[PDB]
Write a protein that binds this DNA or RNA. Structure first.
Length: 75
RNA sequence: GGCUCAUCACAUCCUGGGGCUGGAAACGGUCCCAAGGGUAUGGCUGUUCGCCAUUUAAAGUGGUAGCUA
């Protein structure tokens, strides 16, 4: 599923900061990450293989680029 | 898909005038009175907490949609 993050170019977030921060979770591989779309204040990042909800309910409180952020289903 | 949003918060930094005073000078101190302002733009192998580059007088952290090639 597509996830929203209140982070983007203006918080100096990049596609990698996600890719790196996510893969390092027992249960998730880098192949599970679909398209990532950085924007001004929001990033879209797609999860594959139904591993969406899990990631989501784990990202809720994890330092990405050293800054926990709003995450949840895109919409 | 191009340019245009903030108000705040704790910071932090840049820019005066005037009496007196230190000092051989260069440069300072002190007291009185200020008025404003900056903290930005862009790069980097799609395994994160950075790195780098300019140009800022002054280069940080946090809270939430319009005019047109």
């Amino acid at each position: 599923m597509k996830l929203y993050f209140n982070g983007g170019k203006k918080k100096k977030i990049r596609a990698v900061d996600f890719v790196g921060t996510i893969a390092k979770i027992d249960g998730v591989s880098a192949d599970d990450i679909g398209i990532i779309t950085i924007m001004d204040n929001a990033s879209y990042v797609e999860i594959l293989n139904g591993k969406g909800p899990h990631v989501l309910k784990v990202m809720k409180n994890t330092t990405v680029k050293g800054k926990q952020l709003k995450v949840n289903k895109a919409n």
